[PDB]
Amino acid sequence: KVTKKFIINASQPASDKIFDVSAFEKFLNERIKVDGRVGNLGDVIKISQIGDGKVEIIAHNDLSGRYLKYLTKKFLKKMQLRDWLRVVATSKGVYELKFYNIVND
Amino acid sequence: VRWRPTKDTFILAAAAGEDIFLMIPTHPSVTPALDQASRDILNAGFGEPPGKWARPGTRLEDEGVLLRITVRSTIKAISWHRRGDHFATVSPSGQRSSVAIHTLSKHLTQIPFRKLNGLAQTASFHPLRPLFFVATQRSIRCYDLQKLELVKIVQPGAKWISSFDVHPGGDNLVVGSYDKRLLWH
Amino acid sequence: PQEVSDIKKFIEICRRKDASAARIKKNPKTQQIKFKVRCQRFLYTLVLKDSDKAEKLKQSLPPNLQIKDVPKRNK
Amino acid sequence: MPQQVLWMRRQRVLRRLLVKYRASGKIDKHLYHELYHLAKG
Amino acid sequence: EQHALIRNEAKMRKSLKNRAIIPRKAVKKPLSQLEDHLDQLGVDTEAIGLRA
RNA sequence: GGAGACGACGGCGGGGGCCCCGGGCAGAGUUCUCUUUUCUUCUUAACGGUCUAUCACCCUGGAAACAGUUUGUCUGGAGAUA
């Protein structure tokens, strides 16, 4: 009866309009697997959006945030943003999308 | 002879030989309401083992004593707990079964500390915090009863410790000795 | 290094003539407090595990020994 | 697993059970000695 | 064709045997490459004040 | 008088390390597709206190309806099991 909450913050890439938050929510609903299979998203795991470019994932099962880091890393490669967008952990269960370090040429 | 510290019971524990007797004295103040509560508490636990609990004889039942706990060797000291459910008996020359703690509500006798450095003389309970003092001939070892571990060793200069008492504040000791010395710790 | 398990022993060590250094260590994750005093041969520490007794002990040590809290990240 | 290691593990659990039965009172001394040597075979 | 171009660029970074590589958090990337790549993605690079 | 001060080997037991396996935190890697995925960090000295023992030794007692007992051997009225 324990609840685990993870937050993926994509506020800066969403304000740049380079990251589609709605595409990431649909991606998470097709890729998260519960009992070894995809599409088994029942009441155990729920995904919602917060209006600041953030995605909130609430899990009653033993869902790892490393799995959530692996899924957002997969989405960046499909969107060709892996070379330029990086996933960091800034809080206990908060993962933030930010740019890599850029040097002026 | 030692009284149960609770004012609601009026129960006496007497040390005669090996076995320990618990009685209800026929006193002017034993109200039948108090006697029934005294009967109920002391009989609540009837639902080579150390401490064989048993009923005394028909002569002893009519006289007033009500329980009997026999141990392996003769005992010399009895110490009561504040709540009244625990009491301990020190039996010198009992070796590893020298100090036995008895639970009255469960009719259970246990030896908490098997290895004891020296010959046990007298034990006592702490007046505030849950822990136990056991005094051998030349030392007074303090044991914490929750973790069953020794936390302090008190070393008087006595050749043979006769008796010891603990302050109600629980931070001081007076130690009596057969070599004439009274020591404050 | 030795361990002191009582408060009034620790003050007797701090009142010795060779008591040179005195430090106070905060361990908040384990919720404990350590009082350490250096008196030449040995380092004696006292683990109190109480905030209230640590404040009274801090006021009871001699003012000659400049008691200092241990700063995080030692140079 | 080598037969040496198996014989060995079989002998310990057979001797542990015989001690437990002799301590619990389900067998006597004279039946325990016969069963010990039958186990050694 | 885009699948083959991505697969060819993967082989450009890959080696025949595993080598120790520098993480992207460690390397430093030019300003002009970010505006170039986001322009292919069809993103207004002047709106995001990409000049920090 | 003891220690210093002592041969070679064998099978067994205890204890610590190294290896292997699973989870979690954090970072890194593959990603056309697949991979709740792969890799890396997760350490604790001298010294001091306290607790922990096979053998060995002591007390009681007297053992054949022989017993205890090891993987193996053996041990006991010159005192075994308990």
CB atoms near residue D33 (< 10 Å): 13
Coil vs helix vs strand at A55: strand
Among left, alpha and beta (phi > 0; psi -120 to 50; other), residue B170 is left
Residues 6+ positions from B61 with CB-CB distance below 8 Å: B55
The Cα C25–Cα C36 span in angstroms is 8
Q: To 10 degrees, the CA torsion angle through B75, B77, B81, B85?
A: 30
> CA of D27: how far to CAs of A63, D11, D18, D37, E48, in Å?
55, 19, 9, 15, 89
Tally Cβ neighbours within 10 Å of residue C24: 16
Partners of B77 in the beta sheet? Answer: B90
- Reference B71, options B88, B89, B51; nearest CA is B51
CB C43 within 8 A of CB C3: no
**Alpha helices in chain E, H assignment, sequence order:** 2-13, 31-40
Which residues in chain E have Cβ-Cβ distances shorter than 8 Å to A105? 30-32
E14: left (phi over 0), alpha (psi -120 to 50) or beta: beta
User: Which candidate, B113, B108, B112, B114, places its Cα nearest to that of B52?
Assistant: B108
Amino acid at E17: K
Residue E33 half-sphere exposure toward CB, CA atoms < 13 A: 10
> Which residues does chain E have within 8 Å of residue A13's beta carbon, measured at their own beta carbons?
none
And the tokens for B15? 């040390």
Method: cryo-EM
Kindly state whether A89 is in contact with chain E, defined as any CB-CB distance less than 8 angstroms.
no
Q: Are A40 and A26 in contact (CB under 8 A)?
A: no
Residue B156: which residues within 8 A CB-CB, separation 6 or more? Answer: B138, B139, B140, B175, B177, B181, B183, B185
Residues with Cβ < 8 Å from B150, sequence gap 6 or more? Answer: B113, B141, B142, B143, B144
With CB atoms and an 8 Å threshold, state whether A102 touches E31. Answer: yes
CA dist., res. B13 & res. B26, Å (int):
14
Q: Which residues does residue A59 pair with via DSSP β-bridges, in sequence order?
A: A4, A45
CA distance B33 to A28: 72
DSSP string, D14-35: HHHHHHHHHHHTSS-HHHHHHH
Backbone angles phi, psi at B103, to 5 degrees: -105, 120
Rounded Cα distance between A102 and E30, Å, is 6
Give the mutation candidate from E34, E39, E40 for the A interface (greatest A CB count, under 10 A): E34
The Cα angle at residue B28 between residues B23 and B31, in degrees rounded to 5 = 75
β-strands A4-9, A94-99 pairing: parallel
Q: Are A98 and A34 in contact (CB under 8 A)?
A: no
Chain E residues whose C-beta is within 8 A of a chain A C-beta are 24-25, 28-32, 34, 37-38, 41, 43-44, 47-48, 51-52
Report d(CA D36, CA C53) in Å as an integer: 65
Rounded CA separation C66/A12 (Å) = 51
Distance C1 CA to F45 C1' (A): 14
Q: Which residue of A has its CA nearest to E42?
A: A18
Q: How far is A104 from chain E (nearest CA, A)?
A: 5
CA distance A86 to A73: 8
CA B84/CA B43 separation, integer angstroms:
14
Residues of chain E contacting residue A83, judged by C-beta atoms under 8 Å apart: 24, 29, 37
Instruction: Check A103 against E48: CB less than 8 A apart.
Output: no
Q: Is-contact B57 B78, C-beta < 8 A? A: no
